[PDB]
Design a protein around this ligand. Structure first.
Ligand SMILES: Nc1ncnc2c1ncn2[C@@H]1O[C@H](CSCC[C@H](N)C(=O)O)[C@@H](O)[C@H]1O
Length: 282
């Protein structure tokens, strides 16, 4: 009877606000992958852990019409709710030769040596076991295929949430950005770790590039990002008594902190570094 966070309607519904954060790097990942000017043809592409379609959307806006005539795009995710949203986007944006499909990154069910490109945009730090997913990526890539991934190194949004939580009486705990980033898998916030892991599996020409981004978003949108994340952290970081005393106050505390800090009509400055990784399957 246990739920997976990513399958819950409330999570999926707020994810459009969170995609303003992951989406900072969708163009980066597509462009760094070389998919727009590769020799590989036709293209056979997997957007693995596609979410609500950030990478797929960029692909459909970036690739030549001629390339889309012959490609096949598979938008894969474990979450039925994520794919339902992606399906609507696929229709609304008019993606060509694209399909949604349930794909478990740890056990894809997809054929050996099938894809010219596998994209994993902010998936590896969310999977139960990143390295098992990475092995699947290697398996399903064709000879000459490219893996392109984005993972987080640093960001300011967890620290902003922490600062808000620190305005509640009781000295309540909250993760550091590093603790949050490595909740499921360590290493994917380190260039050297990633380089070594891909090379150990047999990927070649491995490149891992840290890319800084800064933008801003309205306080009301940022509130939704916080409300998506914080409820899943509290059972891990707070006691039962702390939750009984303070969990119901978190939304008010967040509103007050954001208004007080950034202004009632203000914008929250988002700052991140993601690791953009590419590797070739020989
Ligand atoms: N085992 C698994 N297999 C495939 N997807 C998984 C998964 N575990 C989690 N996910 C998916 O990983 C995604 C992480 S959020 C990143 C979504 C998207 N690529 C973007 O850049 O916005 C979610 O859509 C979640 O449902």
């Amino acid at each position: 009877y246990i739920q997976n966070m990513f399958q819950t309607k409330s999570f999926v519904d707020r994810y459009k606000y969170t995609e303003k954060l992951t989406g900072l790097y969708a163009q980066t990942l597509v462009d760094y992958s070389g998919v727009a000017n590769t020799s590989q043809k036709p293209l056979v592409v997997l957007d693995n852990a596609c979410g609500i379609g950030a990478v797929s959307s960029v692909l459909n806006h970036t690739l030549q019409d001629e390339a889309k005539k012959t490609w096949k795009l598979t938008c894969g995710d474990l979450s039925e709710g994520m794919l339902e949203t992606t399906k609507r986007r696929l229709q609304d944006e008019g993606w060509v030769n694209a399909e949604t499909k349930i794909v478990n990154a740890l056990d894809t069910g997809l054929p050996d040596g099938h894809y010219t490109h596998v994209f994993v945009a902010f998936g590896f730090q969310s999977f139960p076991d990143a390295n098992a997913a990475l092995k699947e990526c290697f398996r399903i890539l064709a000879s000459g295929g490219i893996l392109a991934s984005s993972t987080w190194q640093n960001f300011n949004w967890i620290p902003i949430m922490k600062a808000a939580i620190e305005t509640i009486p009781g000295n309540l705990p909250f993760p550091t950005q590093k603790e949050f980033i490595t909740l499921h898998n360590a290493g994917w916030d380190s260039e050297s770790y990633i380089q070594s892991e891909l090379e150990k599996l047999g990927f070649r020409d491995v490149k891992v590039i840290p890319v800084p981004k800064e933008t801003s978003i309205p306080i009301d949108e940022f509130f939704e990002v916080c409300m998506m994340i914080i409820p899943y952290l509290l059972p891990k970081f707070w006691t039962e008594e702390q939750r009984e005393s303070h969990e119901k106050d978190v939304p008010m505390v967040l509103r007050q902190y954001l208004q007080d800090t950034y202004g009632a009509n203000g914008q929250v400055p988002l700052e991140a570094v993601a690791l953009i990784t590419t590797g070739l399957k020989p």
